[PDB]
Amino acid sequence: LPPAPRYFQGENTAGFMRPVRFEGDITNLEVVGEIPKSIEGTFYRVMPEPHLPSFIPNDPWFNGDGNISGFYFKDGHVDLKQRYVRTEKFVREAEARRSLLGKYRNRYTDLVEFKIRSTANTNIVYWRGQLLALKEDSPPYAMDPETLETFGVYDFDGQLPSLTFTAHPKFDPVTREMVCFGYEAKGDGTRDICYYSFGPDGKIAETVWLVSPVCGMIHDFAVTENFVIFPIIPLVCDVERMKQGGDHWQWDYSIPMYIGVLPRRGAQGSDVKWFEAPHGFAGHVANAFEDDKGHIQLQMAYAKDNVFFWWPDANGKGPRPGEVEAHFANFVLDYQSDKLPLAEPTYLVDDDMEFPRIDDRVATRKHKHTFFCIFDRKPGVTDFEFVMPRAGGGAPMSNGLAHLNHETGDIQRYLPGPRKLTGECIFIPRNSEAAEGDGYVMVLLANYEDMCSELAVLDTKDLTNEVALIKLPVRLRPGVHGNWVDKSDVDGHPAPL
């Protein structure tokens, strides 16, 4: 077999990106300032963190084993619990004490035959008394919210119709449904999309098989009262390329950004309309809703070139690091329209942004608040001279949060400081009575001065000021998505506004 390295090497595992790989507890975290005592619940986030050095040199960030952090809040006290998802990959590599899984989504490079290749490292969501650790190439892994024990690969009582479950399911605050899909739903390189939903009782509701015009990456999707929307990233899969040791994904400059629209209830595969947006990168969906006219307003991050530059086109053509900006775009779609080409989107702010969150109490309905990460290159905001040589690479950079009031157009910006970067934020309703977007925002900071992580607690009344700064004595590697589970919500999801 290819030799297993006994320590981490390369930029992807240097400085702040160096794996820690700790599992266990740190109770009674140090706090500067004061955590509002009314906050009760858990902040769950996932980070890719390779448990063993890869036999593949400079293995990307996003191929790392899913490690779950829980920050448990009560009466102004907070405890950390940390545990790896027991994926087939994790268990078999732990048993062998060496890496066995190969390149991102390429089973032809694996040193052994895996049934499930999930790193479960993209998102961690609450559903019917379990956590679901998500990776879009795989079913979810079910975990205990209290202990972070892994129950195992989850198939919804044998109801799961798809080989794949999206990292970005949507929770309808009115119907209490989990709205899901998977792409490559019948295996590597398949154009099959399976759209499916589960009622609050755990019974499967919708199951509609449709066909993608290309085998493109559908990372995120959008749900409205009457429609589900599938934005396709112009990254395309060729199984024959994979069989020769090539990348699962390759950029295609020659195709539009397809946006499929399907009736949410009772539809057939053929009812989908593949609208064609100007060529570009489909980033994370903030939210979608139908306006008075019944037109879909799709608000999402959108870039004009390949954000995933490490997967260029067939001729190796693509952007260089930190060159591509994503902007907060609004697309208008009419399911009635027979005109497939879509107009250029309007932009809601100027900022280079990603990781948009809304008050999920209005998810699938009209929202007037969005919180999102920003990357401001204006000199001084980030001390790049100090940070870059300590940062490593392979992970997206964010040097602030922004709150947009969609009505007033007002923007508040949180700037943690010149030697700190942020992850994805969560929003917490102040209480079950609070107005949309009124309450607390939490965000994990990387402090390159201390080489330590911090959890910032912000009040939405003044996003510029830290109410509390929770000082972790370890590093938490830059992570992906996270979610709030409020103690006052019995099913883990907030009540409709």
Give contact residues for a second copy (rule: CB under 8 A): 6-8, 18-28, 30-32, 51-53, 77, 82, 94, 97, 451, 471, 473-475
Instruction: Name the residue nearer to a second copy (CB basis): 18 or 128.
Output: 18
Q: Tell the smallest beta-carbon distance from residue 68 to Cl ion (Å).
A: 11
Task: Give which of a second copy, Cl ion, none residue 51 binds (C-beta under 5 to 8 Å, depending on kind).
Answer: a second copy
291 binds Cl ion (CB under 5 A): no
Site residues for Cl ion, 81-110, by CB under 5 A, read 86
Q: Tell the smallest beta-carbon distance from residue 59 to a second copy (Å).
A: 16
Q: Tell the smallest beta-carbon distance from residue 52 to a second copy (Å).
A: 6
Task: Give which of Cl ion, a second copy, none residue 82 binds (C-beta under 5 to 8 Å, depending on kind).
Answer: a second copy
Length of the chain: 497
Task: Work out the burial of residue 264: count CB atoms within 10 Å of its CB; fewer than 13 is exposed, 13-18 middle, 19 or more buried.
Answer: buried
Non-local CB neighbours of 61 within 8 Å, separated by 6+ positions: 12, 17, 48, 394, 395, 478
Q: Tell the smallest beta-carbon distance from residue 10 to Cl ion (Å).
A: 29
Contact (CB, 8 A) for 493 and 173: yes
Task: Give which of Cl ion, a second copy, none residue 149 binds (C-beta under 5 to 8 Å, depending on kind).
Answer: Cl ion
449 binds Cl ion (CB under 5 A): no
Contact (CB, 8 A) for 215 and 235: no
Task: Give which of Cl ion, a second copy, none residue 22 binds (C-beta under 5 to 8 Å, depending on kind).
Answer: a second copy
DSSP 63: G
Instruction: Name the residue nearer to Cl ion (CB basis): 140 or 345.
Output: 140
Q: Tell the smallest beta-carbon distance from residue 149 to Cl ion (Å).
A: 4
The token duo for 238 is 């060729």
For 70-134, give the DSSP string: EEEEETTEEEEEEEE---HHHHHHHHHTS----STT-GGG-SS--S------SEEEEETTEEEEE
Instruction: Name the residue nearer to Cl ion (CB basis): 86 or 264.
Output: 86
Instruction: Name the residue nearer to a second copy (CB basis): 129 or 389.
Output: 389
Task: Give which of a second copy, Cl ion, none residue 86 binds (C-beta under 5 to 8 Å, depending on kind).
Answer: Cl ion
Task: Give which of Cl ion, a second copy, none residue 20 binds (C-beta under 5 to 8 Å, depending on kind).
Answer: a second copy
150 binds Cl ion (CB under 5 A): yes
422 binds Cl ion (CB under 5 A): no
Cα–Cα dist 221/197, whole Å: 13
In order of 88, 289, 301, the CA distances from 223 in angstroms are 32, 7, 16
Q: Tell the smallest beta-carbon distance from residue 99 to Cl ion (Å).
A: 20
Contact (CB, 8 A) for 105 and 55: no
Task: Work out the burial of residue 312: count CB atoms within 10 Å of its CB; fewer than 13 is exposed, 13-18 middle, 19 or more buried.
Answer: middle
Cα–Cα dist 361/342, whole Å: 29
SS3 for 404? strand
Task: Give which of a second copy, Cl ion, none residue 32 binds (C-beta under 5 to 8 Å, depending on kind).
Answer: a second copy
Interacting residue ranges for Cl ion, rule: CB under 5 A = 86, 149-150
